[PDB]
Write a protein that binds this DNA or RNA. Structure first.
Ligand SMILES: [Mg+2]
Length: 762
RNA sequence: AGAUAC
């Protein structure tokens, strides 16, 4: 065991024996020595080289290496020491490689990510002496050769991480993202030498010369409120403030000091902690009157198009057209229900039912077929991907949905063509058909032998929204044909039994009330700048739609496995938990069978025992949805995993050579999981920004629920009324509260929206 | 933190 397989990360959860890097101890190795014991305290116990323990949140783990009292302490310590030693020895050599291959990976035009693993492999497999010979070809040989085994050397891994954190300080690499489920790094940006490293070197130089004269000249202009000259003269400083508020340079400490000096020289801002919000306030103050300014949108990793690389790609997307334009089953005038919101972009799904008997119904799930618009759907002559629009699409591994804006994974042209829901238009689908039988027990049974996958056509699309459907199933609405209206009631009654089945039979875990309140929508102004809040609805139509997609996705799992097809699955492992905690958890899991579903107060206590879901190149149980594999196909225009599962289908159904061998898959799943993580983050970050910006506009008291153990006399908390208003409370020393506890009257200390900071007193 | 849709 000198190397390990990245796959054991997916197969395993955090467990004792794991060797970790913590956010606390980024420069010392640690090792998990105990798991959480209760809901009262859900932290893991880690041991340092010194035998000193550390208790930390599962998510404080930045990277993970999978697996007589004194002997145990001794072997724990000597192990950690050995790994550190061999790690340190490589490090001066690794820094040299990092600077070097940074020359080959960099793109001159903007930030560009790379799989962190692929990167580690290059570090290991590279000879500096051969790379410097006047016969480059070598380096490119090592990079392509990174694809093979796929095993990874832990010490090189550790050293590379350390090397990157070091060269991060020179604006050579972006942040290292650590996936929540695997607890391991996924990707890191490679920032351009001239546009970021070098630019900020010249900035620092020009600002410190003649004892910070230009800092001084600038701060004067600000105090004299002459914003005009700032524009002509000091735009490089606006840039700097911008890169701080957006979160691009928040890790370069020189620049933070520079910024401290500037605030120190400005009257209003002089005494205040240097926070992105504060850079935002200033930058707003010295820039022409806007209506809103979400600066998170400037973030390089969020990677919205602004000049750059993505600005190049959208120049293609704007003029791209799916001229790839044949043996499909036609469903005729059979009606297809596309139950989406009024404010929807991509219509990926439709439902059709045929009532055959009182006992039996046949179901058709018509998924848009974006895979069809590309030569790769059918072309067995060329292995891999030749197409521009397709490579780009897979790079934007999902559509980016934010309260501010949306960035579709696919071009507008391809979306109009592939979209469902266009009435009386012959519309290509991929359709999954099967039959359900009502069972004697009142239950329901699914005939997998009915299950069928076909390339179809549909054209009869009833106009429907989750609301219209709901008012229909209440009787409020009767604008629909009685034949159509009854297919809905039938579908709704089928889902109810599907859901009841998933709970009692698949031991699925399904959430109750309160879980998605105060979500964020922008409203426009006298410009989308007004936040309005809502709850995600759990209704008859959502229940209907959801139950079927879940089922569709479960079945393609079965299909891909039985036919030995490489697919992108979505998995969920859960946590390794202490025996007393596993009972606190299990006690809640029987409550869902019995009829009570968990409250968010109840979930807060449980939330300290949950994992997150992750994509995988091979089947693993998604242990929430049920006890079985799960492969997402229902949203091929907005999820890359689904989109890839479709190209495999096109190949298979036309009995062609498949598009992807299993090896090409692991590379993409890494690419996808990376982009998935970034998006979860920036979704939370922006909505938080807006939750807080509203709490600012609204003006001192609110009720909260405790969500953490006191660390330095302070707890984490959340607002029941708002999902993205998470803060910290300074506990009153006069008295300690448990997790899930409510505190009704609380004083607001500070609010920093661009930073996500919310502070309170009791 | 799970799920669906977007
Ligand atoms: Mg829909």
């Amino acid at each position: 065991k000198l190397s390990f397989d990245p796959a054991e990360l997916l197969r395993t959860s955090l467990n004792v024996g794991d060797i970790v890097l913590l956010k606390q101890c980024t420069s010392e190795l640690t090792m998990c020595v105990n798991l959480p014991q209760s809901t009262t305290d859900p932290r893991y116990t880690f041991a340092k080289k010194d035998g000193t323990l550390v208790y930390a949140m599962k998510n404080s783990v930045i990277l993970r290496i999978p697996k007589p009292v004194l002997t145990r302490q001794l072997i724990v310590s000597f192990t950690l020491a050995t790994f550190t030693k061999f790690a340190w020895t490589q490090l001066p050599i690794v820094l040299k490689k990092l600077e070097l291959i940074h020359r080959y990976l960099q793109d001159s035009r903007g930030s560009k990510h790379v799989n962190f693993m692929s990167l580690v492999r290059i570090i290991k497999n590279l000879n500096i002496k051969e790379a410097t010979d006047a016969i480059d070809a070598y380096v490119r040989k090592v990079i392509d050769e990174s694809m093979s085994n796929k095993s990874i050397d832990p010490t090189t891994l550790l050293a590379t991480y350390w090397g990157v954190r070091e060269q991060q300080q020179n604006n050579l690499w972006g942040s290292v993202y650590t996936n929540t489920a695997l607890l391991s790094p996924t990707t890191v940006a490679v920032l351009p030498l001239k546009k970021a490293h070098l630019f900020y070197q010249e900035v620092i130089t020009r600002l410190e010369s003649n004892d910070y004269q230009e800092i001084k000249a600038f701060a004067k202009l600000v105090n004299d409120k002459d914003y005009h000259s700032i524009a002509k003269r000091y735009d490089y400083i606006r840039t700097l403030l911008n890169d701080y508020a957006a979160g691009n340079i928040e890790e370069n400490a020189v620049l933070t000091t520079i910024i401290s000096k500037i605030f120190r020289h400005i009257d209003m801002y002089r005494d205040q902690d240097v926070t992105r919000s504060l850079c935002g306030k200033l930058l707003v103050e010295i820039s022409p009157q806007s209506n809103s300014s979400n600066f998170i949108l400037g973030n390089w990793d969020l990677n919205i198009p602004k000049s750059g690389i993505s600005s190049v790609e959208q120049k293609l997307y704007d003029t791209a057209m799916p001229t790839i334009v044949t043996d499909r089953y036609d469903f005729g005038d059979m009606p297809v229900f596309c139950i989406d919101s009024e404010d929807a972009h991509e219509i990926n799904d439709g439902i059709s039912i045929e009532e055959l008997d009182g006992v039996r119904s046949r179901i058709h799930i018509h998924i848009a077929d974006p895979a069809g618009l590309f030569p790769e759907s059918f072309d067995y002559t060329k292995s891999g991907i030749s197409d521009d629009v397709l490579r780009v699409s897979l790079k934007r591994a999902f559509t980016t949905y934010l309260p501010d804006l949306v960035v579709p994974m696919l071009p507008k042209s391809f979306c109009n063509r592939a979209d469902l829901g266009k009435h009386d238009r012959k519309t290509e689908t991929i359709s999954f058909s099967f039959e359900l039988v009502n069972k004697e027990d009142g239950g329901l049974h699914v005939d997998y032998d009915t299950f069928q996958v076909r390339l179809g056509i549909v054209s009869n699309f009833p106009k429907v929204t989750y609301d219209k459907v709901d008012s229909i199933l209440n009787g409020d609405d009767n604008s629909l044909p009685s034949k159509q209206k009854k297919q809905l009631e039938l579908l709704h009654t089928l889902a109810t039994k599907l859901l009841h089945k998933r709970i009692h039979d698949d031991n699925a875990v399904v959430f109750g009330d309160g879980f998605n309140k105060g979500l964020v929508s922008l409203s426009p102004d006298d410009e989308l700048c007004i936040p309005t809040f809502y709850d995600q609805s759990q209704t008859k139509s959502t229940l209907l739609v959801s139950e079927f997609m879940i089922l569709t996705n479960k079945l393609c799992a079965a299909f891909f496995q039985e036919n030995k097809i490489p697919g992108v699955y979505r998995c969920y492992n859960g946590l390794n938990l202490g025996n007393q905690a596993k009972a606190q958890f299990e006690l809640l899991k029987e409550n869902i069978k019995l009829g009570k579903l968990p409250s968010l107060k109840d979930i807060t206590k449980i939330s300290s025992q949950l994992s997150s879901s992750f994509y995988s190149p091979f089947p693993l149980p998604h242990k929430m949805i049920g006890n079985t594999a799960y492969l997402t196909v229902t949203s091929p225009m907005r999820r890359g995993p689904d989109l890839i599962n479709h190209l495999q289908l096109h190949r298979f159904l036309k009995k062609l050579p498949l598009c992807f061998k299993q090896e090409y898959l692991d590379q993409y799943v890494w690419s996808f999981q990376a982009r998935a993580d970034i998006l979860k983050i920036f979704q939370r970050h922006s909505s938080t920004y807006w939750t807080l910006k509203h709490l600012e506009q609204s003006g001192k008291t609110h009720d909260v629920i405790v969500t953490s153990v006191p660390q330095n006399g302070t707890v984490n908390c959340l607002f029941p009324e708002y999902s993205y208003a998470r803060g910290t409370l300074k506990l009153d020393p006069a008295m300690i509260p448990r997790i899930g506890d409510t505190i009704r009257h609380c004083k607001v200390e500070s609010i920093h929206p661009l930073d996500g900071i919310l502070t309170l007193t009791h």
